[model samples]
Target: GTITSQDDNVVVGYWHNWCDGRGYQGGNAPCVELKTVNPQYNVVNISFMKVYDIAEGRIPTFKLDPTIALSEAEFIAQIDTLNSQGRSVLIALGGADAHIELTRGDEDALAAEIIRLTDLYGFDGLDIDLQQAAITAKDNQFVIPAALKMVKEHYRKTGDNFMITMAPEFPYLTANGAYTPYLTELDGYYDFINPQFYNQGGDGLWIEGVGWIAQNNDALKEEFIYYIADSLINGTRNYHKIPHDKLVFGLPSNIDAAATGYIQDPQDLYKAFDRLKAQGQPLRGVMTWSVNWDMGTDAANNSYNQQFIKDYGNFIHNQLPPVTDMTPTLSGIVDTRVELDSHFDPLIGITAKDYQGNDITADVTVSGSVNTNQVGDYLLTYSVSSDDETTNQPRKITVYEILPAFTGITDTTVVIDSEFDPMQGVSASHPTQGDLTANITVTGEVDTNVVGVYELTYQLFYGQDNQQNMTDKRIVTVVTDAVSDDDWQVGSTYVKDDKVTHNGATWTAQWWTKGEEPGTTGEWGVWR
Candidate 1:
């Protein structure tokens, strides 16, 4: 069945008349049901409506092979059903071994026969699959162009949709080849060209001469295949200019059809096709040898043509260049984060782009441990996958506690012989700081009986990891007038035989001076 539009990739599978579902050749080849033909294919070329005789004494007529068990009405109805589903059916002309003949005067008769086939078989179009006897040399090839133009115009005049396609072997359309002229002449008239790139044995264009020959290595084979496809598209021998969108590269569906130049892996062929598509070429897609041969259950044993369309055809149809699409990647600062209870919309400054250069920030899926209610760092990984490859970008987030207050508290002082407690009137403030009085502890001692100044330290331990340690200090002085105090003062009176403490030492029989403190050796250094 035909596809909805030119925008869709075209998969043309040929249905041959010879194979009759018998013998090893036709082992699993059942009669083709319009439904059974893979929906993945957009077109089917019934190969072929060969020349039966020259009727009207000279006009070409065709006869269907008796082995094809469908009546004319049944086949036309099948074509109608396919057409209703937007699938195209065409009658392919000639074959590998048929004699497709035409005279200079046979243009009108040829046009009429094409119309008759369309009416009788409900064909959407016709294919010129000439080889060997049908085309032979370039001498008589002019007849094909003349007849195609008349028939194409007749359909045009009737407001009918007539699609014309050509299936030429590799050598036939190569630069300066014999069949190139006829194709170039019908350029604007035919819908598309399917050049059989397989079975030619790789003698492509001779590396622009010198007779040294070219090798088919990985790189060369890619170059070699594209060489044929590009030559047809860009014009060769200074003549052909078929549009790139109108060129469908043809290959055998399986190894049984692989007489020569058969690539064992379909992926290798896809690689080549992708190259052409990458170069701004809107490749029309693939055309396999025949559907009947694709069905055999022999040791050849693989049905690949249908699967090729399933895997690559849908992609080719939707894309201008098949694999220019890359996995979506996210970019911004590394280890990005937000504070606890902080507003988090990661898409804000962050962005993502695919290989096609399309922004995909919305489609980026994020998954990781992120909790606003909890403290500590979390990993918020942003990920995106396109065509099955996932790319991830992670952001580290830390949730921290607001530290408690020791703001209202200050260093305390006490005179000697007075009671002292570091935590007597201290209390922390802040909703999250929570009962700091219980977590607070004194580090330094304040002894009431000692005649010395002592520093008392208070510390509050809070926060998730106990990292927020806050502290303050208070000093206490044990003093009895000035004689009993351990810290010496500038204004103190001392008499002989009176014990006094100066700079943590007991001194007696030293007259104290009002302006003198202890430790220094001065004339007025009293109490030493």
Candidate 2:
């Protein structure tokens, strides 16, 4: 049995396999079966697979407590049961009472014994709980990591995975300490590092502005936990850096769980977790010592560990900020527009609301602009902030050209001596810039005195810096007496049966009309 991945926020608890008769404080801390572990603790590290005799120089060993009336088969069955329920049971090596010293040549022997114990007891992996003299020893650092690698490689060959974790006391994790080498060697090989934040007297984290914050100081306990975890995460103060996802803050479950570092109120730890999460730190989770001590009754007959479990469960699972529907509602927003046709208002018809359906439209801010006076594309972004999160939506507005139109212009013929007005019945209008009739300039003269076909080119410049222009032409044949029906005029009023030829076609008006072209009128229009 193997565990592929651990939970995002894991609650690790060390299970005491043997009953020591007395707890850290005054009450009786009796050992409990692995099957009775609370569901909240997903990872359970069985305490102490220790070396009984250092002189013998054999591998470390594990045996069920003789005082409890359980067979070896029953204990192994319980491990299998916990595994089926998605709980990982690992053998913790070298607790406070045990001494595990390994040299360079002991790697193969250590790995072999660990694998044997793993297969025999159905353990998922191993936890390095080395402390005191055993950890400070010189060769243990290199040997332990080397042996764990061999164990991990062996498990990989069988197509199974192994989880390796470390629980070092807080003092050993400071700048340039003994634990630094172990962490350096086992960088990516281990799953997580749950550094024990309790049982060390007066020792605490060194913050930047504020000096040493003691763990015993109940008022500053939250700061102590936060800064220490921060130090590990950021590697500040020259401490070994571990990623937030691979670091877990270890704490005592209750007053009886540890001597000096017990947090009387669970809210203090929750506050620290909240701050970490707010800072965008996804910490692995919390760990507590000895589940048996958490279940032990105090002098007042109240089990404080039960309350600790409930509070932690809510914090780990339900402390996330509520999901907010921050998208803004927009209305009458068009993706395209014509130049100078209409004004654009970004905030118009836009409404914003928070998760509770509270009106937050006033908080909406716009980041871009649109210019209807110019022809181009524009991007406007609408943003609103709620619950420390921002939501933005973008809109693109494209401005197209609006060509100039000639209102009253047509081609006509006049006698040789008749007076001719090139600008007569001719005006141009730009959609963006109102009337451009005054800007119209005529090129090529229509000389009524000469008997020849002449063209009068009417042109007008519109838009900024005269970026756009339009042109229309009219022909005047001197001395040609009505060569053809007068080219259909734009603004001229026509009665019924009035005939004109335009675009090489003859059309007759069915009724009185003005400003309508001959060929443009449909089948049912006034022109036939």
Candidate 3:
């Protein structure tokens, strides 16, 4: 529905995945027919669709990635479809920074690529969503600057009317560290920055739910959120040169304000509305990060979230902007550390979020002091709190050593067999190498005279480790009977309880067990 209702400076709501087709995030659940809702609020300014990975539905903007093979005609057709009905469209690129798997795609190349796309597809503009690349592509910090610089310089070079902007995740601190660098470089070129300031999490436990909701009635809730928001504005100011008017805080989906552990229940939507209105300009107005994540669906009782959307929209519809920028001024740099060889890192990927339960800006600031190069268990501690949400529930992430093939091997053992023995039979113990056990069975013949001088040949094999290096040795042995038959006859003989029947055997005796079966009542069975 509507994200906000304001005078000239309306709340510009943006749906993150314009068409991000994530399998888990409504991938195959049928395209969310945009026509279902009429871009409800006339106040809305723009919407962003990721062009990063078509498969991931993360960022569908990049052209070369085979997964995002968007045909110019098809893409433009969609844009025109929206534009025809009065909705501005833009391309959101870069997701988690390391999203681009290729090592050669530097800033200059990426800038050239964007130009190619804009010219080829006849699109409106571009949006940047650069998350923590410190984990995979450390060079992105440098690359982002170059690409953004290229975008800015290119605009000056060609005089093309294309909008360049950003959509950094919430808790302004996160936005500041990971994306502020690029934003700073693109200051002159960019139109606006959409900072997701509302709706911290949709699927986590409650306490974290505060960041997204307005000030819930809980004393702890407001305190938690104030710390995060204040730090973010201050942190961003310390890192980047962007002014207040350039930033637009984000609000998406329904605000649950449900983290009871962190905040109070039945969140006061009115107070949050009042807070947004009061948190005024350079911080001009509130913008819903998403206009339609739930669309009033019951799959997860989304109505609970949608209600917050309606309330926030109404609140923004009737708010005012601050005379000066609400963003804080900062002094020192935020320190962040990561432990790569801890928290079973090899087997799992760890993430941290604010009390609102939104993923934090995992940058050098958030990842300040720790080293993850050595292989050992280490604790990674970082703090991220935002004003529009909660932060007291500090997140925990552990880094651990990860080996592709854990002490594994390819080839285990080699097998060899000796010539057959005419007397008895091949030795009975070598089936295959690498296998734990090797056994040989006599099949050809069995004779009393030959058995006396029979000798069989076989080898046993073993391996060292995953290297699979192995060694073998031949085992030679003779098979002989302890007793010789007095007469040559082939028949069966009885040995105690065992009745042995053969064609024509001889006399033999052996041991046997005779007992009564146990009874449930501690008494022997009648057969005993």
Candidate 4:
């Protein structure tokens, strides 16, 4: 089975395995069961798997804290449970009170011991927390990196994705400082580097455009945190270059967690985080001194650490990708219609993306085909997958044949005894075959001597063997003349100065006329 890995961005917390009665800075922290640790901490570093006495040997040892009454089997069960939840449990090599120094020949022995601890307790990886003399000791720098490399290689062969992280004080990470060699040697081998940003009092970062910002100052604290993390990300000031994705800022959990670096408000830290994220920086995450200090009890018996977990944990986890029900989304699918033998593209506007805004367009699979040579409707299915979830969409394509059609023809009205032509403004056309007006056949006729309604039909035969054809009809109505004074009667005689209206206008007879309509005569004829 493969080892459970931490999230790309993590919220790391050190869990105390031993009870000092009075926690760091007298916070009165208690040793709790590993299973009781908050889920907000994606990576839990079990504090201090250390060498009890250097005179005895360089091999480190581990034991459950005296206050925690769980048996060895129970402890291992808790680790397994957390692993199942996609959280990583690691053994921290040293703490503020512990020492871990390895000689030249002791590299293989320490590696074997670490591998033994991993097999016995199922640790996903190791966290190097060596501080003070433990890190500055002779031969430890070369020995430590060699031993960690051997352990990493051993797990690589077993198909486990082993993780290795480091937590050094801010002072030790300076250019060519004590911890620089460890970083240089384990450049690509280590997973992330979390440099502690607390406990050094006024020591902070010197920004390029800005001067040195004191970490302990209340006003410039946010700037101090952001610029220090930025420097580590870009390797400014000639420091060891750590990738933005592999650098996590380390801070204290509460006022009592560290001497001088306690943040009175979490919003200041959030502001710094927002600034980095706005600039498109993908810093790994944040880390705190100890989980015990976060849950420690105060003089009033109130636990501020519990609130810390709620506030910081929720904010941190919200910044990461969602854990469940993540599925990809599809776009740019639409029904289409095209003429037969015309060019068509199925994926012209198709696209797909995951919930994290990653472009998965290339991963989208298309099913079904469009035959441009045939005249029919085709159904196409498009699908994209992310992890165990998948999304699908369907589209339709219609292929049609070209046919001839009538362009300009409409019903018309005429006065009695007037001339009319059905095909005066009528014409026919085909989309692909151009104009076919001359090929149209006209039927029916109208007589100007009679008043009645007449119908005319125009037809056009096209395509192979005249199999396809189009027909249109026009109706011509002959109406009586309109009148302004008296109605004009057919075959009735009218004298000069007699007024009548035709087509909504007044007309007077110039001379005597019979059987002639008012508007049917020419402009210079009898009716004017």
Candidate 5:
């Protein structure tokens, strides 16, 4: 895209997994949550796919730990969601602080790895974040360019714009001229460049024979960018000159991201761009150190992205990154279990969708059975195919025996020395078997020989192996016999409901009394 006005400065930033502010920032505070990042950032690079094995001729591939801050599914979904909302998501390879060795890679293998990641995750492009390590590699002049050209050509067949970006340190490109090969040979295939302007102060630009100077010198930061552009694009140091619009002036969003290069305010940052336009430098826009550390340090705690928009105008635009076929989604009620012989019946219904959340419920099919009379785990399987992909889901149903109900046993109380039978009031039954009285086993004895309570159990068992069983208890209480009329004493105290033998019959005291003749009182005589 051609930049006709100053409003064309694209706001780009990185999304880092290891953002605890240690290596790049100061302390262990989080940089930015992935979810907090918006799709509006022109390009959001997921950082540091470290080189797993250089000797294996492999490209960078870092496995994310789902057990920590984010799950694999969640991270991939965020990328998908962002891509859907028109944001260019690129997987960045290498880090400024970590070593991602490309020394042992072949062009074919490296290109293959790039293709693999792009196919698996639907990335719009790749960003080479290699610093001194990559350019310093002995064989990179031949291997790196070949791999990038191959990747670019292969993706070109898809009829989609595939971007190739780079984030090199300030000194590597402008001072040491480490990227002379990239700017000269690979410049045509490469999209843009963001030379980090924060870290090395003394490595800025040479005044005459003055050599590299500090970033905070009297000259505007845009003046330093002038030196870089002059060296690689406008001057005679490279194999070829990179275009002006392909150059993005890079700075740190937070001072804590690096010890230096942090622009204190948006107004100060705007002066640099204003100076650039005055000098006829129509660059590709601005790139930041990162979105992670973009939060403010003061009471206002404002987001630096807001400041970028405030100064440079809108940088985001709608995009339609290509997508691969997605697997179907099967979601609904889970499996369940019921007790054996329990009104055994199971009902099943399932819901489904495509990977992009389009409803596919009508296309889903379920198959399986529930043998309620049998004891086992049954699977209710569900499957759906949508968008050229298929997914299967299985639900479990466990059927077990239901315990029988043992009833018809009443607890009884009897006087001491009285005959007591435990089995007299016991009965049992089952829901399916109906009357299970014969299956009931009455156990234990109620003793009338002693003044105490005893229990008699009535139990019933279901199933051939007696898997389900239930029991009911009958309690009997024995007490000393009421005093006979001949043994009644005149001074004896009796309470209400206490039985005493009088006139050859048992009578209960209606109230507290002493030496009371029960037969003479109608209230006492009425006691039963």
Candidate 6:
């Protein structure tokens, strides 16, 4: 049987042609069940078929008019009464019985009724449920164009006269459902389309079967594989064609398709729907097939959950910007902790990205220093720039260094040669009296690297006896290859009797200066 009746509402609302609101007789059962079962469910949308019946007639009748249906005064009053009890009534217009046409209404009359319902009923908005209905009916003077014209004109009366919502089935169910081609025709009409993604498999499964088989099953699988099923099905309804911004992945809750084999488990359906919704897809809503099927309990069906309400409310209010939202993410890093002779050196790597989450094409500028002796913390700051126009983000990286407490040098190879004053790279406690001379009474530190004499003159007492006799200044004449064995005399006393032969001459300590040589006896100048 063709689905003459269309149903919807996020929380679920059952409607029959005969119900007072829909077709059910005046009863508080649905209300009682809701209150007793789940105290948390905040909203329940009640749908009625009056709007559909009006469209079916293709002519405004006495009954279809706001003044006709339950006295205009009583109708509005009743709605207020229900609203006081915390209930929202969303009137579903144009249904299965719809001859797919709009009823005849002059601009004045149509406008009047629309105003009355919105103003009096305190109704929030109008939901266009015109499915299988021709945009125009037979022999009507103004049909397709008129219906659209009427709706548009009436809707424009006040910017907030009423909110407009339309339910358009997914356009992807074509020959193969390969991927739904963009339906640009419907673009200008609806602000946004909630494609009834219910009834997914009547033809979806079959069309998707071959594609799934081709992509998933090769000679490698052992079991019946349906890998690409979810993708192909969802993929056919590619968001690209749907103007991803204006369209939410409208799905049905805990419902089934009568003719189509598309059997979406109510719970499973919610699970899949919530996952995508959580990911922040364009999710305005989700509709249950019918309120009748729903037990409408926290435990019985559990579909009317706090989580569902929260997610829906969040999706509406929380609209994040569609920019790439990608910052620079580090892909790889280079960190070298190698020794530099006797110290440590570090190499750091930094990467960057654009606001679009795309890796930026940029060259990074890096420069930093570290104490190679030991490691504590190191600072390495890097900035990257691309050929893009204006401002750029720079990443600040820190580098630190730690020196070991015992980090002094005993490098003997580094010969410090100096004569104490004004000379560097040398160790000398006292200045030498003359270059290349050593008259050192105190053996202080010395550097013998330079070959010249550096006399380190200092005051000292030099006498043979234990008593300090000559308290006079002596020049520590530091010399290299200057003094020889023949120059020095070896004896307890420097008397004439103490003599040594060297180079065919007699040497004596009494005449140690160059002017007196005992061997020559040039005139016998021994005692000087």
Q: Select the stronger candidate by lDDT from 2 and 5.
A: 2
Give each model's whole-structure lDDT: 0.64, 0.77, 0.40, 0.79, 0.63, 0.36
Return the candidate ranking by TM-score, descending: 4, 2, 1, 5, 3, 6
**What's the TM-score of every candidate structure?**
0.54, 0.59, 0.43, 0.59, 0.52, 0.37
User: Of the candidates numbered 1 and 4, which has the greater lDDT value?
Assistant: 4
Candidate 4 regions with alpha-carbon error over 4 angstroms: 20-25, 320-528
| Candidate 2: clashing residue pairs, number | 0
Candidate ordering by lDDT (highest first): 4, 2, 1, 5, 3, 6
Q: What is the C-alpha RMSD of each candidate to the true structure, in Å?
A: 25.9, 26.2, 16.2, 22.9, 24.4, 29.0
> Candidate 3 at 522: error in angstroms?
90
User: Could you give me the TM-score of model 6 versus the true structure?
Assistant: 0.37
Q: Write the per-residue lDDT of candidate 4 for residues 1-528, one digit (tens) a residue.
A: 137787567889999886634644555777878888888888999887987776868777676665587788888899999988889988898776566666788889989989988888889899988889888787888998899988988998978867899999887787678997687666556787888888888887677777878878878878887887777765677565566677788888877778778777788888988887777675677888878877787655567656667657777767754223245566678889988778998888888776444678899998999998789999999999986778888899999997777876687788878877666778888786678888788888877567688888888887656666788888887776743477788867899999876676688999998888888788799998
The TM-score of predicted model 1 comes to 0.54
Residue 346 of model 6, lDDT score: 27
- Indicate whether candidate 3 or candidate 4 has the larger lDDT: 4
Weakest lDDT window of 10 consecutive positions for candidate 1:
210-219
For candidate 2, lDDT tens digit of each residue in 1-528?
Answer: 544336556778898867844656676667888778788787889988888776766467787785655689888888888888888889999897677767778889999999999998899888999989889665788888889989988987887778889999988887578887677666556778899988888887667788888878888888888888888876676676666777878888777778878787777888887887788775788888867777777766666556556658657755443222223232234455545647777787776655333567899888888887677889988778876666666778887776789976687878977998888888888665788898888999877777789988888887777767888888878874647787888888899999988887888999999999887888899888
Q: Model 3 TM-score?
A: 0.43
Candidate 6 ranges with C-alpha deviation above 4 Å:
1-17, 20-57, 60-78, 81-88, 100-113, 133-161, 171-191, 199-201, 205-271, 274-280, 295-528
List the pairs of residues colliding in candidate 4.
Answer: 294-305, 482-501
Model 5 agreement with the true structure over 442-505: per-residue lDDT tens digits: 7888778887878877777766676557777777788777645443456988777777777667
